[PDB]
Design a binder for these strands. Structure first.
Length: 1073
RNA sequence: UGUGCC
């Protein structure tokens, strides 16, 4: 509960010249006392009197009531920051070395020198894009510094290392003064022109980096990145994190974890000697020298010191550095610059064509319905993103403009303009609008934003390909319900003294111009073969349309802005934006890896243990009929690079016998590592999310980084959360939500009271608050109801429905209309109205909690009912599993050591149900987990009607409605739904093997009735409680359950009526992946 | 409506 105490100190620190606590209680009499206390405090403050007497008088309110919020009556002028900053600003300011970046505008010049006229100015290249101010970040660091000013021992060293660092930030910022932000947390030209262009972004990155400093090594790393970053803005991250690929090959393997037949992690005590050719060492040295040429000193030395022995025990430092560089911010070039960079492929093209044919061969011959009604499927699937051009649209009687894809389709249909049979051009006549994706370290890549004709003409086929991939292991990113651990396991498996791994990053090749010809032709050739396999008119048109999109792309043109103008240039390369983007790319890399491997063998004779393609990378494990030597590696590597070289492909191929390093993960010393480079105080782009959503997201980013090996002080995160989640009443009245409001599992939850432990209200007050918050979950929007009543809109819903189902409409119909009413949420005007409504409702709720008829049950209610029926008792679980994921914090790591981990994801969509499968066979419709959950619990007769209404044949529908499988499905649908409400596949839990035998013994549950749903919830609740206790106390306990027989029947009724809560915390988990 | 595909 330290969050509440912390908030007062921070507020007291920020303002000085009052704070009014606000409590509430589920007990009528106590609440009145809370009302009396609030009135007295306002009255006393209004008269400038002390509140000390009142606190003693209302001792009971402080002691038992639950704090809801804090009132901030501050009469200053959001200043203080200028005054506060100066004491810390003494050291010498930093000077921008305007000679380190190629492209001029990437140097820390004076804003004016970049944009002389306020009309030439643009933040397009430095916009933090986050909804929190630079001034607030600075305020947070200073506040933390003051609190930890009088600390001792090791704590002091952390303060001192941090204090030194912020000195550079403070002094440099002062030389120009703190920049001021507008209403939308943006930095305009007037504040900007006197100050160095990249000043605001740089300060944010350094502050974020410093508040994540603890050990001396952290201090050394943060300082080099900070000073260097201010000058360098385009290669520092890349230079710092490049030696990592070379490093993995060096470390030896002493006991690793592999994959077994049951596809689960199993420990192997083997030893694999690292074999590295002298040439590789020269390459690493060149990389180190390059870091040095760029002013780097401390970082290069650390890598060099490590190299003397390359002990996997002193390797965490290398890992720490790799995670660290990403925190220098994003590299945002000029669209044109990002855009500008851009006879033997016969074997390569053929494989791509063959792979495409396999993925649809069976679907095409049979005459799959999805292929037949592909157009309908695209419409249901259709998103609410952009279509490319801002159009004027009329809805009922309102004339407004939108760019949204959904809006364009509805307007077009109501004008006989809807024509998916005609796939628009993307050449010189109708150039493609561009989209951009920015990431730290790597170069900016462009994105096509093609007309919805393209999404529709490709949605059905890509879905078919994904299903094929779903069961093909070569495609690591799509295989089964696998996670990254299984992939990690597969590489280690066949590792021995007569086998070498081959990893390759082909990010450059994917964009190449050489690539697009062979790529498009291969897909097209495949499409022609598939067409020569059926006679179905519906299938051919859908198949034919897909072919057309590939042809139009072959010769494309792009609209790249060059200032304020839009130059139309010829883009002869493959860019992402299509539907088949990921699936096609995966096919292309796999075809490519296969092509290189085949050419090499003519020379060498090996065995292919495994081949894989995962994202922009691809790798393989080969086996030779002899012991691998340093000389052998050089020969295999030179030939492989040469094979890539002949195909004019620019890639980075490496050969090792112990580890590999790709974009998503890296393996060194038999251990699995994952980069932890998520930016905190700077984003990639702006969206339509609120401050609360962003605050929830920041906490999430912090949790993933903390899990991955990059920790940022929690107090700083908490401090950031307090500033972000605040709400102003006036220009001097600001309301700060309490910890209970912030952390309770409600529609307004932002973070967990205690990291790695999701709590649920076990007290009456929490329950009272939870019920109240839900009360005001959804808010109305006029602009939204308007269009929801217009003609064109209802017709669009009606046209989709009369095309989909046969019999009656409503469980399906209500969903389609709503699913379509929400898509309007991309339209800012509607988004803005919703937020304003939420705040006003929120201000009143914090002020004085309202009443609620409840009548709605949730997950928290089910858990609360169970709790009082378990008996706790100290138990003990020894550690049996060696550590394979080192970066993991100690408390999280301990649970894995004692009970183990898993290599799969727990099905939380119900897709593995027989009924869901049956719907898939005859319908293009895709029910949600929630819809399936409501549907399964319906009267046998009702279910039969619903299946028929969707097109399911009578003999099939009738057979299911009474079978054994339907009964089993009932339990399965609920199990999937319950896991979903408990986020078992997210955060820290996704790691633990909840089916662990060791975990299982700690649970004692005697059957007293026997009813699937009831048994599942008790075991799950017990498993979560035992694990959570373990996370907090580092020790274990055993659980006994004596739940009544009468009680279970009541509980079961409760279970089939659970509602789902929507909250920023929930959104953030969805947001991560 | 400072707007940006899968």
């Amino acid at each position: 509960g330290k969050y509440n105490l912390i908030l007062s100190e921070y507020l007291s620190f920020i303002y000085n010249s009052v704070q009014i606590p606000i409590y509430y209680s589920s007990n009528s009499e106590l609440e009145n006392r809370c009302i009396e206390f609030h009135s007295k405090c306002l009255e006393n403050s209004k008269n400038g009197l002390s509140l000390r007497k009142l606190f003693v008088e209302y001792n009971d309110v402080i002691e038992n009531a639950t704090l809801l919020s804090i009132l901030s009556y501050s009469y200053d002028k959001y200043n203080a920051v200028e005054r506060k900053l100066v004491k810390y600003a003494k050291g010498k300011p930093l000077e921008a070395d305007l000679t380190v970046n190629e492209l001029d505008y990437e140097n820390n010049k004076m804003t004016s020198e970049l944009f002389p006229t306020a009309e030439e100015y643009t933040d397009s290249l430095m916009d933090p894009a986050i909804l929190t101010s630079l001034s607030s970040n600075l305020n947070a660091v200073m506040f933390w510094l003051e609190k930890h000013e009088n600390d001792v021992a090791e704590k002091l060293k952390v303060y001192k290392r941090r204090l030194d660092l912020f000195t550079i930030v403070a002094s440099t910022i002062n030389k120009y003064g703190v920049p001021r932000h507008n209403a939308k947390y943006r930095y305009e030209y007037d504040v900007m022109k006197d100050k160095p262009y990249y000043l605001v972004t740089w300060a944010n990155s350094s502050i974020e980096m410093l508040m994540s400093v603890f050990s001396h090594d952290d201090y050394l790393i943060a300082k080099e990145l900070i000073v260097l970053s201010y000058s360098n803005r385009s290669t520092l991250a890349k230079l710092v994190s490049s030696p990592m690929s070379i490093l993995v090959a060096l470390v030896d393997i002493n006991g690793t974890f592999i994959t077994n037949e049951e596809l689960e992690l199993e420990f192997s005590n083997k030893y694999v000697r690292a074999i590295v050719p002298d040439q590789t060492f020269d390459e690493l040295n060149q990389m180190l020298d390059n870091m040095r040429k760029a002013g780097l000193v401390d970082i290069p030395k650390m890598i060099q010191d490590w190299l003397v022995d390359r002990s996997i025990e002193k390797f965490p430092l290398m890992a720490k550095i790799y995670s660290w560089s990403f925190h220098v911010g994003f590299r945002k070039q000029k669209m044109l610059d990002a855009a500008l960079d851009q006879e033997m492929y016969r074997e390569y093209t053929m494989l791509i064509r063959d792979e495409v044919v396999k993925m649809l061969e069976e679907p095409v011959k049979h005459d799959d319905h999805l292929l037949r009604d592909s157009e309908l499927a695209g419409l249901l699937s259709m998103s609410s993103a952009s279509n490319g051009e801002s159009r004027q649209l009329k809805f009922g009687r309102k004339t407004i403009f939108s760019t949204k894809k959904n809006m364009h389709v509805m307007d077009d249909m109501a004008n006989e303009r809807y024509t998916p049979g005609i796939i628009p051009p993307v050449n010189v006549d109708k150039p493609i609008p561009l989209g951009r994706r920015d990431v730290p370290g790597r170069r900016t890549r462009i994105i096509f934003i093609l007309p919805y004709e393209y999404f529709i003409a490709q949605h059905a086929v890509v879905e078919k390909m994904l299903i094929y991939a779903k069961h093909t292991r070569e495609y690591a990113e799509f295989y089964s319900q696998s996670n990254q651990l299984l992939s990690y396991g597969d590489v280690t498996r066949f590792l021995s003294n007569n086998t070498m791994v081959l990893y390759t990053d082909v990010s450059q090749w994917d964009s190449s111009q050489h690539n697009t010809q062979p790529f498009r032709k291969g897909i097209i050739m495949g499409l022609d073969i598939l067409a020569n396999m059926t006679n179905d008119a519906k299938v051919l048109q859908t198949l034919n349309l897909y072919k057309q999109t590939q042809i139009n792309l072959m010769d494309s043109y792009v609209q790249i802005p060059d200032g304020n103008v839009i130059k139309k240039i010829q883009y002869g390369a493959v860019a992402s934006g299509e539907k088949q983007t990921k699936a096609a790319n995966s096919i292309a890399n796999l075809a490519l890896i296969k092509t290189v491997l085949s050419r090499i063998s003519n020379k060498h004779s090996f065995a292919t243990k495994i081949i894989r393609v995962d994202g922009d990378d691809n790798y393989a494990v080969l086996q030779f009929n002899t012991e691998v030597t340093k000389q052998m590696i050089q020969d295999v590597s030179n030939d492989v690079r040469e094979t890539y070289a002949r195909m004019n492909a620019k890639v980075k191929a490496l050969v090792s016998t112990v580890g590999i390093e790709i974009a998503k993960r890296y393996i060194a010393g038999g251990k699995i590592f994952f980069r932890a480079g998520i930016n905190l105080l700077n984003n990639e782009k702006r969206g339509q999310s609120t401050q609360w959503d962003q605050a929830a997201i920041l906490y999430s980013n912090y949790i993933v980084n903390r899990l991955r090996g990059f920790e940022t002080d929690r107090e700083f995160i908490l401090t950031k959360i307090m500033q972000m989640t605040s709400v102003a009443i006036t220009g001097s009245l600001r309301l700060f939500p309490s910890e209970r409001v912030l952390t309770t599992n409600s529609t307004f939850k932002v973070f967990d009271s205690e990291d790695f432990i999701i709590e649920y209200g076990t007290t009456v007050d929490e329950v009272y608050i939870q019920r109240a918050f839900m009360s005001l979950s959804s808010q109305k929007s006029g602009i939204a109801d308007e269009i929801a009543a217009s003609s064109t809109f209802k017709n669009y819903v009606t046209r989709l429905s009369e095309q989909l189902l046969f019999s009656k409409n409503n469980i399906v119909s209500r969903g389609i209309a709503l699913t379509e009413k929400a898509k309007l949420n991309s339209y800012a005007p509607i988004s803005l109205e919703k937020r304003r409504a939420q705040i006003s409702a929120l201000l009143t709720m914090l002020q004085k909690p309202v009443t609620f008829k409840s009548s709605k049950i949730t997950i928290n209610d089910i858990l609360r009912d169970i709790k009082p029926f378990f008996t706790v008792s100290d138990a003990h679980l020894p550690i049996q599993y060696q550590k394979f994921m080192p970066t993991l914090p100690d408390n999280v790591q301990y649970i894995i050591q004692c009970i183990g981990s898993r290599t799969y994801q727990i099905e939380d969509d119900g897709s593995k149900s027989a009924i869901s499968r049956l719907i898939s066979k005859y319908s293009v419709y895709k029910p949600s987990i929630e819809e399936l959950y409501k549907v399964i619990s319906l009267h046998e007769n009702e279910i039969q009607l619903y299946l028929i209404s969707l097109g399911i044949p009578k003999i099939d529908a009738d057979t299911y409605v009474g079978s054994k499988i339907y009964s089993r499905d009932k339990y399965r649908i609920l199990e999937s739904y319950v896991y979903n409400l408990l986020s078992i596949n997210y955060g820290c839990y996704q790691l633990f093997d909840f089916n662990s035998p060791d975990l299982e013994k700690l649970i004692r549950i005697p059957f007293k009735g026997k009813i699937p749903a009831v048994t599942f919830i008790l075991h799950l609740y017990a498993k979560l409680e035992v694990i959570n206790y373990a996370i907090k106390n580092g020790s274990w306990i055993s659980l006994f359950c004596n739940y009544p027989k009468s009680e279970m029947i009541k509980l079961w009724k409760k279970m089939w009526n659970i509602t789902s809560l929507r909250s920023p915390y929930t959104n953030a988990n969805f947001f991560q992946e």
